[PDB]
Structures are given as structure tokens and as C-alpha cells.
Write an enzyme that holds these catalytic residues in place. Sequence first.
Site, PDB file in Angstrom:
ATOM      1  N   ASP A  26      25.018   5.609 -10.383  1.00  0.00           N
ATOM      2  CA  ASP A  26      25.857   4.590 -10.886  1.00  0.00           C
ATOM      3  C   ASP A  26      25.275   3.286 -10.498  1.00  0.00           C
ATOM      4  O   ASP A  26      25.075   2.921  -9.466  1.00  0.00           O
ATOM      5  CB  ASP A  26      27.518   4.394 -10.393  1.00  0.00           C
ATOM      6  CG  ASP A  26      28.334   3.508 -11.144  1.00  0.00           C
ATOM      7  OD1 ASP A  26      27.734   2.999 -12.251  1.00  0.00           O
ATOM      8  OD2 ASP A  26      29.032   3.197 -10.835  1.00  0.00           O
ATOM      9  N   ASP A  62      25.770  -0.397 -16.477  1.00  0.00           N
ATOM     10  CA  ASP A  62      27.032   0.592 -15.897  1.00  0.00           C
ATOM     11  C   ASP A  62      26.584   1.763 -16.372  1.00  0.00           C
ATOM     12  O   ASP A  62      26.879   2.109 -17.742  1.00  0.00           O
ATOM     13  CB  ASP A  62      28.240   0.242 -16.437  1.00  0.00           C
ATOM     14  CG  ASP A  62      29.077   0.932 -15.331  1.00  0.00           C
ATOM     15  OD1 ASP A  62      29.163   1.996 -14.928  1.00  0.00           O
ATOM     16  OD2 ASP A  62      30.593   0.264 -15.378  1.00  0.00           O
TER      17      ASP A  62
HETATM   18  N1  I0J Z   1      31.477   1.535 -13.096  1.00  0.00           N
HETATM   19  C1  I0J Z   1      32.796   1.729 -13.212  1.00  0.00           C
HETATM   20  N2  I0J Z   1      33.488   0.680 -14.001  1.00  0.00           N
HETATM   21  C2  I0J Z   1      34.814   1.002 -14.326  1.00  0.00           C
HETATM   22  C3  I0J Z   1      35.361  -0.049 -15.168  1.00  0.00           C
HETATM   23  C4  I0J Z   1      36.799   0.514 -15.593  1.00  0.00           C
HETATM   24  C5  I0J Z   1      37.485  -0.833 -16.414  1.00  0.00           C
HETATM   25  C6  I0J Z   1      36.572  -1.603 -17.329  1.00  0.00           C
HETATM   26  C7  I0J Z   1      37.467  -2.210 -18.454  1.00  0.00           C
HETATM   27  C8  I0J Z   1      36.698  -3.539 -19.077  1.00  0.00           C
HETATM   28  C9  I0J Z   1      36.806  -4.661 -17.932  1.00  0.00           C
HETATM   29  C10 I0J Z   1      35.923  -6.030 -18.526  1.00  0.00           C
HETATM   30  C11 I0J Z   1      35.073  -6.069 -19.357  1.00  0.00           C
HETATM   31  C12 I0J Z   1      34.548  -7.121 -19.746  1.00  0.00           C
HETATM   32  C13 I0J Z   1      35.138  -8.288 -19.200  1.00  0.00           C
HETATM   33  C14 I0J Z   1      36.263  -8.198 -18.597  1.00  0.00           C
HETATM   34  C15 I0J Z   1      36.708  -7.138 -18.240  1.00  0.00           C
HETATM   35  C16 I0J Z   1      37.176   1.326 -15.350  1.00  0.00           C
HETATM   36  C17 I0J Z   1      36.667   2.346 -14.457  1.00  0.00           C
HETATM   37  C18 I0J Z   1      35.172   2.147 -14.020  1.00  0.00           C
HETATM   38  C19 I0J Z   1      34.666   3.131 -13.179  1.00  0.00           C
HETATM   39  O1  I0J Z   1      35.206   4.265 -12.810  1.00  0.00           O
HETATM   40  N3  I0J Z   1      33.313   2.890 -12.927  1.00  0.00           N
HETATM   41  C20 I0J Z   1      32.645   3.814 -12.144  1.00  0.00           C
HETATM   42  C21 I0J Z   1      31.494   4.500 -13.058  1.00  0.00           C
HETATM   43  C22 I0J Z   1      31.974   6.100 -13.565  1.00  0.00           C
HETATM   44  C23 I0J Z   1      32.187   6.141 -14.670  1.00  0.00           C
HETATM   45  C24 I0J Z   1      32.444   4.484 -15.218  1.00  0.00           C
HETATM   46  O2  I0J Z   1      31.375   3.985 -14.211  1.00  0.00           O
END
Ligand code: I0J
Length: 329
Positions: A214, A34
Site C-alpha cells: 500500500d 493509493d
Molecule cells: N489507503 C486507504 N485509503 C482508504 C480511504 C478510505 C476513504 C476515502 C474516501 C475519500 C476521502 C477524500 C478524498 C479526497 C479528498 C478528501 C477526502 C477508506 C478506506 C481506505 C483504506 O482502507 N485504505 C487502505 C488501502 C486498502 C484498500 C484501500 O487502500
Amino acid sequence: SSNDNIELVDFQNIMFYGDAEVGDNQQPFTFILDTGSANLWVPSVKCTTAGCLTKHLYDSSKSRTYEKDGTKVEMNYVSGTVSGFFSKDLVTVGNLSLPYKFIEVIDTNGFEPTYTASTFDGILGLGWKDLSIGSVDPIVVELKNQNKIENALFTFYLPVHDKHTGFLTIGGIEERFYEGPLTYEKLNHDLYWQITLDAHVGNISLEKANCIVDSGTSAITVPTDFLNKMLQNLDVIKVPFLPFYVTLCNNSKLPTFEFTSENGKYTLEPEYYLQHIEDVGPGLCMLNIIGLDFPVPTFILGDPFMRKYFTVFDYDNHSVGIALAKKNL
Ligand SMILES: Nc1nc2cc(CCCCCc3ccccc3)ccc2c(=O)n1C[C@H]1CCCO1
């Protein structure tokens, strides 16, 4: 190269999954790269949800290198609800093993149906500390602070084709992966990997756009107005009450997404932003374009752009480098 090349797994040509291990017992867990997310996320055996039980879960007791900050961390994203506690332990990725601070999640209900269906058990944080929680330094920057890699850089080689195998070279750049020129573009900011490029789709113009790459995103974003003005009688079927769009696979009206800038030019073509959705209706292809507006002009170069262009990231240069990805094999 002697650098750490983490193979990326192909999934429905819609997402790539990278294997990894966390804890002294090197417990294995599937994590997707990510470019945005920062603080690593880890599923926990303490997670009581049904979706957690079907996937790998980390154990805090089976690690002699484990540490318990205890500080609570609640991540409630939109249509979501997540909760975990700070926990530092040995994070083993390929030939490198660094103690890192991760968020031990125990609640994943707000995305529990989406996770249960998905083959990933966690996520990967490869962004600037600016987007990191609890002031956690970037993994690749900390590998360069240690005598583990010589450059704080990481490159991506998406396994688009079924035979094509993904790779994440960390610490150097292999010309083998990228064929032709490698151009760098300055970053509009150092908080997260982002650049300033001038988007031009034929006669339609939008200069000074914050193009942001991304690996998580599985589509190329675009301002709402730009998505519509460009798609005027291009035989592009729209889905009502659903953020999706279908269109003929062979239509000549399908444009190329091009980004011009002073250091060089980039071009994504129809074969990259189209999906073989002929599964439901033969000959029908879907535009992998998700329109969305933001507070300042911004675009998203997700899997589509990264799939065709070998990506390069350097915290030390404060720039994103791009080059044509070598043909499979
Ligand atoms: N990719 C992407 N993920 C995101 C993920 C989240 C939440 C993640 C929380 C953890 C979830 C999880 C992890 C492991 C196991 C179970 C659950 C929020 C916003 C974005 C979000 O905005 N994005 C877009 C781009 C721009 C900046 C970040 O990445």
C-alpha cells in the site's frame, strides 16, 4: 522513458505527494498515490467546510468536458463521514488526458481536522476495478485501452531521501530506477494488488501470508500476535493507550522483516522500519510497525517496504514485481 513518469514529492519522509490536474481548465490539485483506493476523489468548490477553503477545490462550471451523473456517493469510513456526487470530466495526469468518472466530494468533516493539517487536497486510485465504485475501470487499464500507453503497468520510485526525487513510470519499466534482480510474485486475487508470501522474523514463523503493498499506508503492518511474540525483551518501549512504539536506534536485538517465496526472497531492515523520533528524546527511534489482525493471515508492505524496493504492478501479468530501488542519484 517516453512513458509518463509522475514525480513524487517527499513530505517528512512519512508520505509522498503527486501533483495532478482535473477539468478542462486543468485545475491543479495535490493527490497521494493509493495502491488500494480506486474511484478518484476530488475536493469541490461546493464544499462549505473550513478545511476545503484552505486547499484547492474543483469547479464544475469552468470545464467544457465536464459531465454530471448526479448519482450520490456517501463514503463514511471508520471515524469518518464523506459525501459526494458522481461527475465525469477530463483527468490530466502528466502527458496523458483521459475522461474519467470522479466522486465530487462536498462533505469532509469526519476527516476535516486531519485534512486541514495535511498538504494533500485529494487521493489517487490505482487499484483493480473490483475495488472501484460505480463499476469504474482502472486509470492505467483505460490508458492501455486508448493509444496512450502500450502496457497496463505502473512502477513507483519513492523519494525517501530529501535529494531523492519520486517518480511514477506508467506504461513501462526503467532499469535505471531498480538496481539488481526484478522478481515477480503471483496475486492471491485480482480484486486489489495483493500476493501470497511466507513471513519469517528469525525463529518466529507465519507462512502463506497475504502480503499487500500500500503506497497510502505509511508503515509495515503485521498480525497482533506476531508483533508481540517477536518483540520479547528487544528493548522496544511501548506507548500505552496509543498505537505507537519507541526503541533504541542502535540496538542489536532489532530484527529484519523477511518474506520468502518460490520465485525469490525480500528483506526489510531496521533502518527502514525505524523513525528518527530523537526530536522529542535524542537517540530514541520509533518502530514504524502498526499491528492489526484481519479475517485471514495478512501483512501490509507500506511506505517502508516500497521505500527500499522499487515496486512494479502489471494488470496484464496479474502479478506484483519487486526489485532493489537504485541508491539516490
Ligand atoms: N489507503 C486507504 N485509503 C482508504 C480511504 C478510505 C476513504 C476515502 C474516501 C475519500 C476521502 C477524500 C478524498 C479526497 C479528498 C478528501 C477526502 C477508506 C478506506 C481506505 C483504506 O482502507 N485504505 C487502505 C488501502 C486498502 C484498500 C484501500 O487502500
